[PDB]
Structure formats: C-alpha cells, structure tokens
C-alpha cells in the first residue's frame, strides 16, 4: 500500500472540494462556480467515454445530466446518468462483443481490469436478469466503488501497489493506453478475452506503452520468450557446506 508511482509520477485525482458539504444545512456543497465546475465535467467526459471526442450535437443530449450535476453535486450520480445514456451504448454496447462491453465497464467505472473468469461470468449473470442497467448499477453500488471513489472524486486509474492479484495490474495497463488512445480501435474484439478465460497473461510492450513517464518502460525483456512454461520443472539447488541440496 505504498505504491511508488501514484502521487509521485502521475497527477493527483480530480473531484469535488469535500464530502462534508452534504452535512451542511444551508448548502449542499462548497459551490464551485462555472469555471471550477466545467473543468471537472471535462474530466468526467474524458473518463467515462475514453477519448471519444463527442461533438456539439452529441453533448446536447447530455444537457439534462449536467444540469442536475450542478445542483446535486454527487459525482457518482453523474457517472450513473452518463452510463445509461444513448452515447454510452452507441459506443461500447452496439458494435462490440459481450466481454468487450464488460471490460470497458471495469475501465470507465473502476479504473482496474477484471481479475477472474468467475468475476466476469457473474456480470453476465446480471445481464440475464435486467439487461445492461443491472451491470452498471451493481458496479456503481458496490463496496469497491464506495471505498475508493465515493461521491467525491472521478473514478481514475489508481496505482495501488497492493493489488489482490498481480494479473489485475496487467489487465489495467492493457485497458488504459497512452493519452493519444481511445477505445474504438479494435473492431469490437475484447483484448483481455483470451487471457481471462485461459488464465495466461498479457504482452509486455502493450503494458509498457501505458506506464507513466519515468518508470523504465520496456527494459528487462530478455531476448528469449516473455511468458512462463507451466510444465517445466527446474532444479534449483542450495549450497550447504558439504554439497548442494535440491529441496524439491
């Protein structure tokens, strides 16, 4: 839980001033004002949509979700209103496969990649009982969303250091890319789909493109293979005084 990249080599996460404004009885929040407001809305538009580059006649259909956001200052309700939009399903649901839609919900709303096939198949268990709105509100009303983001900050890609699986850090680095990278470049076709269902890992050059500036992006590759052989049984011996002991 130290995480040597997070507030050192990246920026600080954006969001509202505090969460004590909800208990204030003459206001609802520290009132930001329309220069301090819309530059936070620029960071929700760059995160829920990727870099989708939404036009002026596509933002006009999102007029109602901002007008509620500048009165009720909850960030989580703004993210929930933008994921049930037409502009979220015409980019990430309409021409994609099912695990491509699921792997972008982990990117846009959690900042991580899915850790399992069992965690991934339970999101298709919620598709059968309520469609795509049952997937979206179960991510938003989860415990993992509450104890990382809450109502206060935008859901950002967080370098944690103490990931519950090491593979979770790998699939986060494939999902986000560089800053000149959107998420329409594959023709559908989930990137993490082979590695979730089989149990293997990712490619080292695809992860090191998305690492920050100043973190040895790519070195360490020996010129032999990049993954491990599960069938190999090596002999690793320890020197004692007399000989060499192969505690296998």
């Amino acid at each position: 839980a130290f995480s040597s990249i997070q507030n050192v080599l990246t920026d600080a996460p954006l969001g509202t001033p505090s969460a004590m404004g909800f208990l204030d009885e003459r206001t609802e929040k520290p009132l930001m004002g329309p220069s301090e407001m819309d530059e936070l809305v620029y960071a929700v538009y760059k995160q829920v949509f990727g870099n989708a580059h939404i036009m002026e006649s596509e933002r006009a259909e999102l007029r109602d979700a901002e007008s509620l956001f500048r009165y009720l200052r909850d960030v989580r309700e703004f993210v929930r209103a933008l994921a049930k939009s037409n502009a979220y399903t015409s980019r990430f649901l309409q021409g994609n496969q099912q695990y491509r839609f699921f792997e972008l919900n982990f990117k846009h709303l959690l900042g991580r990649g899915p850790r399992s096939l069992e965690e991934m198949a339970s999101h298709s268990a919620l598709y059968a009982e309520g469609g795509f709105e049952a997937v979206i509100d179960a991510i938003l009303d989860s415990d993992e969303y509450a104890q990382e983001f809450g109502s206060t900050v935008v859901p950002y890609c967080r370098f944690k250091g103490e990931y519950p699986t090491n593979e979770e850090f790998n699939r986060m680095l494939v999902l986000k890319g560089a800053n000149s990278t959107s998420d329409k470049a594959g023709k559908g076709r989930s990137k993490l789909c082979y590695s979730i269902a089989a149990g293997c890992s990712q490619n080292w050059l695809s992860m090191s493109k998305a690492l920050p500036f100043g973190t040895e992006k790519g070195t360490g590759f020996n010129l032999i293979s990049s993954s491990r052989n599960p069938a190999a049984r090596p002999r690793i011996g320890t020197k004692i005084p007399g000989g060499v002991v192969f505690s296998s």
């Binding site: 969001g15 969460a19 004590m20 909850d74 990382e148």
Partner: peptide, 20 residues
C-alpha cells in the same frame, strides 16, 4: 478523499423522511 463516514443515496432518503 473519500472520508469513510459518508453515504450517497441514504443522504437522498433522510431529507425526504424527516419531512415525512
């Protein structure tokens, strides 16, 4: 920046339950 003693939609509830 999350400040653990905090909620999101029971905060919606009790302002429309103390009036009730």
């Amino acid at each position: 920046r999350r400040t653990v003693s905090f909620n999101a939609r029971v905060a919606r509830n009790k302002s429309q339950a103390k009036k009730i």
